[PDB]
Amino acid sequence: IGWRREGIKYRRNELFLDVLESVNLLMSPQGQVLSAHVSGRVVMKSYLSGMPECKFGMNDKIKQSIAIDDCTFHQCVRLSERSISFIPPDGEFELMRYRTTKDIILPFRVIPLVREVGRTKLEVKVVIKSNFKPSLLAQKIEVRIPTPLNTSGVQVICMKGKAKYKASENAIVWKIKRMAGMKESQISAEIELLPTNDKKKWARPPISMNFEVPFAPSGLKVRYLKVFEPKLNYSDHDVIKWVRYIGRSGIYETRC
Amino acid sequence: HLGTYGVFT
């Protein structure tokens, strides 16, 4: 086996899995999801004794059960429910890579509201809502609200987080360190406008977010990682096993 | 913390 040498021993047989997903979304002003998908990989870190034969199972019949549009594996994987089998390399490696479009969890919903006030002001309210177990925290949230090019200034109020108006980037940026499942937050801004060429209207680009969440928005869950080394005297239960999910936004736009 | 490991199994 050219990916794993032959005499590895560890007193503490222990492995680590990372399910890394990036969630993507294009949503219309009327709440319809125009397009959405998730890309993910599973990375494993293993410090197991021998040349063990592991079995990776997750929620894929296709409660909990998810549908994978496609995916590729690491050579060590023996192709042929029917689950994934391999003798992994030692250390850290990319077990599989996958894609997904159905029954995806959109961790965040964004609700924009905008009010034209004569020719001087825009009034904008934006609400974000977290869609997930309240026991879970999202971290590193940013909402990004574009302003027209004739903005002379911006005032905003927001009871959670901080938001700076950023002229170079032509956007209001709201940042929240942590926020829990099933909650709501909002921001209000008033945008003061220079005069402009009446004729060319403003093309409102989407409001966009960045966030990181501790679960796989594809819904994928790890169920088991069975280890078997037949020559040596450690069994599956001897193995300490950890798993952790890091879901993050890719592109996540909402049109107003 | 996001990025924290959970035991399973």
Domain boundaries, chain A: 1-105+213-251, 106-212+252-254
Class in CATH terms, A106-212+252-254: mainly beta
Tell me if A15 sits within 8 A of A241, measured CB to CB.
yes
**Is A35's Cβ below 8 Å from some Cβ in B?**
no
Contact residues on chain A for B2, CB-CB shorter than 8 A: 137-140, 212-214, 246
Same-fold call for A1-105+213-251 versus A106-212+252-254: yes
Is the alpha carbon torsion for A173, A177, A180, A185 positive or negative? negative
For B2, which of A16, A224, A246 is closest by C-beta distance? A246
For B8, which of A212, A241, A246 is closest by C-beta distance? A241
Please indicate whether, in this complex, the C-beta atoms of A139 and B2 are within 8 angstroms of each other: yes
Resolution of the experimentally solved model in angstroms: 3.0
Nearest-angstrom CA–CA distance, A62 and A49 = 33
Contact residues on chain B for A137, CB-CB shorter than 8 A: 2
Nearest-angstrom CA–CA distance, A82 and A29 = 42
A175 is in an annotated binding site: yes
The CATH architecture annotation of domain A1-105+213-251 reads: Sandwich (2.60)
φ/ψ of residue A172, rounded to 5: -90, 130
- Tokens 């998810």, residue located: A66
> What is the SS3 assignment for chain A?
CCCCCCCECCCCCEEEEEEEEEEEEEECCCCCEEEEEEEEEEEEEEECCECCEEEEEECCCCCCCCCCCEEEECCCEECCCCCEEECCCCEEEEEEEEEECCCCCCCEEEEEEEEEECCCEEEEEEEEEECCCCCCEEEEEEEEEECCCCEEEEEEEECCCEEEEECCCCEEEEEEEEEECCCEEEEEEEEEECCCCCCCCCCCCCEEEEEEECCCCCCCCEEEEEEECCCCCCCHHHCEEEEEEEEEEEEEEECC
